[PDB]
């Protein structure tokens, strides 16, 4: 017959292969092999530490020395609060406009009260600041999606009155709501899907996971960002333009590399591990960003649960009540803005109004990348803007913080 | 409805996504991040030179002062010889037992000449002494190819006689046998597919390929291997077992990834160069090797011209002649074996029988990886044999060269 077929190689730029599952194995296998040999000599350094009771314990004992521990736990109050006004609203008290009102007074009691604690105490750490800011805003985000489903299924009922699963008012316990709240999803569902059981080696996996992964974001920060940063110190508040470029230029690619470390070490180490503690079933937490030839492409694929959120309960609830869709996908990326402003600059009382430039640019950007390149190129510019982009924002806070506090 | 399923995260070790054409991609943009500035610079400097006419014509003025680019001039004496036979074996002349004997003679001087006008010359360069060998062995398996297949077109229209495409004999042409000579394949077949034109963009992609890995690859020697070679100068002849290992795990890694370079920079680059120049149309020359959960599979797809060529002229017909398929299989282990040898071997004039070793444990190595090892740790264990594996056989030849001659 024949032994030569007209076909194309696999690496070439219009074969359609995309079957690379030994390049990722590839990156894993050189990893441990270039950094196995420091894991077990700093596991074994910093495991024989007793840290979970005796801190725990140290912190019991003085609940003023540990204010982002005492936010996190007193969110609690507005969970409880989100509850009660919900079961009034259940029984039949309060009724539909009331209860509205009082979920917008405690959602916006969740957010502006943290930043005023962590704004008027200076005993505060940023680390711990950002992990309260951080809990608080994953609590608010919860609690809206609480308060939607909540309404529609309540609504629903009231329709059908004038005519295993779990229908509406029976979810209404506190094991549900604090089942939720340590889920990993910002989407409220009734009947969240389970998992059949613990699988011991996978939890064990991902830990281990989350302890190298560290150690290895540790490593890079400390030999390969402090140093490049005390190299030439200078705010970024004052530099021009072609210093502040000049100096990101050389500091973008190790902060990609403590990006990338970062995504696996939380959207599948950090809540794959919760996810596997209690059984939750759903795991999809990404998709295919990095194939990803269009920055809303990326967007839509890189942080599942907010981009799902921000999608049922911000977007479509807004083209329900038409308004434009052009404005409610804005309105959409004006609120993520917010949110990482929020997020990035409390913690370190920063007010630069950066990560909200970078959110926002992210639209001409969106359009540039869609009309000018196309395909690998097209990826490979998303790729561009990654490394550049909207991360550079973070790093610049980070950066100016740092050099004005050592 | 819902909007939680029951799935699997896609770097799960069981999700079955398999589509990472964004890491080759982030590969790419961060080689050139990291290499363009210095590719732009070298190639400026380095493109301003008329290397070919001047060479050819300081070559042509001294046929004795470059005896590699004349061995692989002579060879096509052999070539002619192989192709006059052939032909007077159609016309009627010579039959076949004669014609099967001088085409084993016209083999055997192809392989055993060379070999001994490189080891008994003192003016020849090992790295032309390679490049002539691996030209002659090129050759003989494109001869042997030729002989195979005329011979059973010829058969086949003997056996017909007692009852656009090319028939048999119509083909034997000088044109036809020096695009079957510089054609990206060993195994020769009438009617090569074609491709339909030059595609200029393309060969300049390629040749940019060419020219980036070489300038990537000389980086990695001499400044990766170069000075860890230095670092401890002792021949691997004479170092026990625990000194030459810890000198392989230290060479190591600079070694493979020298290798995953010139794997892109040869068999994706180079031959789809020469495929394009002159229209080809398989451009199939590999697969997907890197996800490959078993030796057996990784043989199977590296390097497949080789590989065709080993199936479809010693493997079927070997068990053609049924010869104990096993012994079979072990019998192309040994050819490959050998030939190994005699390329990494005679132009260092070493004959410490390494590569030789690596290519014959690579069955007991299959074995192992296969009955052990399964899934992507399979894959895991495949990567870790090719980090210290075979490769580093051509390694320790090239490491004693260098250490006894400067
Ligand atoms: C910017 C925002 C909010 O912030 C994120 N923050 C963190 N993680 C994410 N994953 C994010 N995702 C986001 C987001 C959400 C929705 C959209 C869609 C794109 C599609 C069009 C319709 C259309 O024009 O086809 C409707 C709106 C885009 C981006
Ligand atoms: C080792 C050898 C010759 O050298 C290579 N040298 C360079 N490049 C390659 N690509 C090579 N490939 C090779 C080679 C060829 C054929 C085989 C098959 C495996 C399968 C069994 C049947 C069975 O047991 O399923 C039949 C024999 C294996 C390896």
Not at 136 to 149: G, Q
Request: glycine share 4%; aromatic share 16%; hydrophobic share 50%.
């Amino acid at each position: 017959l024949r032994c030569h077929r007209l076909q194309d190689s696999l690496f070439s730029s219009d074969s359609g292969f995309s079957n690379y599952r030994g390049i990722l194995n590839w990156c894993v296998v050189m990893l441990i092999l270039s950094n196995a040999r420091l894991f077990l000599e700093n596991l074994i350094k910093y495991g024989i530490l007793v840290d979970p009771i005796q801190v725990v314990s140290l912190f019991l004992k003085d609940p003023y020395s540990w204010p982002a521990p005492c936010l996190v736990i007193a969110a609690n109050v507005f969970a409880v609060a989100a509850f009660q006004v919900e079961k009034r609203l259940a029984v039949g008290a309060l009724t539909e406009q009331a209860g509205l009102l009082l979920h917008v007074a405690n959602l916006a009691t969740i957010l502006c009260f943290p930043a005023a604690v962590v704004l008027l105490v200076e005993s505060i750490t940023p680390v711990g600041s950002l992990l309260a800011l951080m809990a608080h805003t994953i609590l608010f985000l919860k609690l809206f999606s609480y308060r939607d489903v909540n309404s529609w299924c309540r609504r629903a009922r009231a329709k059908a009155a004038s005519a295993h699963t779990v229908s509406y008012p029976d979810n209404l316990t506190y094991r549900d709501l604090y089942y939720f709240l340590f889920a990993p999803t910002l989407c409220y569902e009734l009947n969240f899907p389970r998992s059949p059981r613990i699988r011991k080696r996978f939890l064990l996996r991902r830990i281990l996971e989350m302890l190298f992964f560290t150690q290895l974001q540790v490593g890079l920060i400390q030999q390969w960002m402090v140093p490049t940063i005390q190299n030439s110190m200078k705010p970024f508040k004052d530099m021009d333009y072609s210093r502040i470029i000049e100096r990101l230029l050389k500091l973008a690619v190790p902060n990609h590399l403590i990006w990338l470390i970062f995504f696996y070490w939380l959207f599948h180490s950090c809540l794959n591990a919760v996810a596997e503690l209690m059984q939750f079933g759903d795991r999809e937490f990404y998709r295919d960003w990095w194939n990803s030839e269009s920055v809303t492409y990326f967007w839509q694929n890189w942080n599942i649960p907010v981009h799902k959120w921000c999608i049922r309960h911000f977007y479509k609830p807004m083209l329900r009540r038409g308004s434009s869709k052009w404005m409610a996908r804005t309105g959409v990326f004006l609120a993520s803005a917010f949110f990482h402003e929020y997020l990035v600059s409390v913690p370190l009382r920063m007010f630069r109004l950066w990560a909200f430039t970078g959110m926002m640019a992210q639209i001409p950007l969106a359009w540039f990348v869609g009309r000018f390149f196309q395909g690998n190129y097209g990826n490979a510019a998303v790729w561009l803007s990654l490394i550049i982009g909207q991360p550079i924002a973070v790093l610049m806070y980070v950066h100016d913080y740092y050099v004005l506090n050592y």
